[PDB]
Each structure stands twice: as C-alpha cells, then as structure tokens.
C-alpha cells in the first residue's frame, strides 16, 4: 500500500540487469497511468497507458528533454484493464528498457538518455491503487 504519486529512488541510476517491479490495481474508471524514469527534470522514459484517447486505449512512450517532449512511440497492445490487478516489470537492457505486463512481453524502448547512472528516480502516477514498487539485480 503506497500513496500515488509515488517516488522510488534509484540509487546511482539504472544499469543493465536492473529489474523494476510495480504491483497495483487499476481503478475503475481509470483514465491514465504513468511511469516516469527521471534524470533530474528530464524524463528518460515515460510509459503512459491511456484508457480513453479518442475512445481508444493506447500506450504512449516518450522522453522529455529540457521540458520538451520528443517523438512518441505508440504500441496497439494494451494489457491493462480497469478494475484489475497488474504487474509491470521494467528490465533495463544495454540498448533499451524492456517492459512486460502480467508476465507477457509488451514493448521495448531504446535508450535516448545515455547517462543511465543519472536516471535516479522513478515516479509512479495515475489512476491506480499502488501496492508495491521495488527493484532487484538479475
């Protein structure tokens, strides 16, 4: 049981083989979820499930640099369901973040921010009950 928005420090940033696991339940009438891997004010990796973008469900991924969003990467696959418990796993790999939801691979996001060891916070926000947020080295 955690308060949202929640900040998970990532000491010394991220590194390949670091696995971040987020457990929570989507609220009933959810509109959005966001994970923001931050390098100071920059957002190295924004992972943003949108439950009603012109009556479609889509996950938007992006990077924010000097307060400007870049070019979005969008996937059709949408494994979240309002009202239901989920698990998000983000595994840092040498070239990308690799995301699985409920043990199924979902997407990869190539590293735009290169200074992995400065991506030192994860913000978790949106329309969820957040149960836990943690990391481990695999």
Swiss-Prot record:
Its main location: cytoplasm. GO terms for cellular component: cell surface; collagen-containing extracellular matrix; cytoplasm; cytosol; extracellular exosome; extracellular region; extracellular space; ficolin-1-rich granule membrane. A major expression is found in the colonic epithelium. It is also abundant in the activated macrophages. Expressed in fetal membranes. Keywords: Acetylation, Cytoplasm, Differentiation, Disulfide bond, IgE-binding protein, Immunity, Innate immunity, Lectin, mRNA processing, mRNA splicing, Nucleus, Phosphoprotein, Repeat, Secreted, Spliceosome. A beta-D-galactoside binds at residues 69-75. A motif (Nuclear export signal) lies at residues 114-129. It is found in: Cytoplasm; Nucleus; Secreted. GO terms for biological process: eosinophil chemotaxis; epithelial cell differentiation; innate immune response; macrophage chemotaxis; monocyte chemotaxis; mononuclear cell migration; mRNA processing; negative regulation of endocytosis. Galactose-specific lectin which binds IgE. May mediate with the alpha-3, beta-1 integrin the stimulation by CSPG4 of endothelial cells migration. Together with DMBT1, required for terminal differentiation of columnar epithelial cells during early embryogenesis. In the nucleus: acts as a pre-mRNA splicing factor. Involved in acute inflammatory responses including neutrophil activation and adhesion, chemoattraction of monocytes macrophages, opsonization of apoptotic neutrophils, and activation of mast cells. This is Galectin-3. It comes from Homo sapiens. The lineage of its organism: Eukaryota, Metazoa, Chordata, Craniata, Vertebrata. The chain holds residues 114 to 250 of 250 of the full protein.
């Amino acid at each position: 049981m955690l308060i949202v928005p929640y900040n998970l420090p990532l000491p010394g940033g991220v590194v390949p083989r670091m696995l971040i696991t987020i457990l929570g339940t989507v609220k009933p009438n959810a509109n959005r979820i966001a994970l923001d891997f931050q390098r100071g004010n920059d957002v190295a990796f924004h992972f943003n499930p949108r439950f009603n973008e012109n009556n479609r469900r889509v996950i938007v991924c992006n990077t924010k640099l000097d307060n400007n969003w870049g070019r979005e990467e969008r996937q059709s696959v949408f494994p979240f369901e309002s009202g239901k418990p989920f698990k998000i796993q983000v595994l840092v790999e040498p070239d990308h973040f690799k995301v699985a939801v409920n043990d199924a691979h979902l997407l990869q996001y190539n590293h735009r921010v290169k200074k992995l060891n400065e991506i030192s916070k994860l913000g978790i926000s949106g329309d969820i009950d957040l149960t836990s947020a943690s990391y481990t080295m695999i």
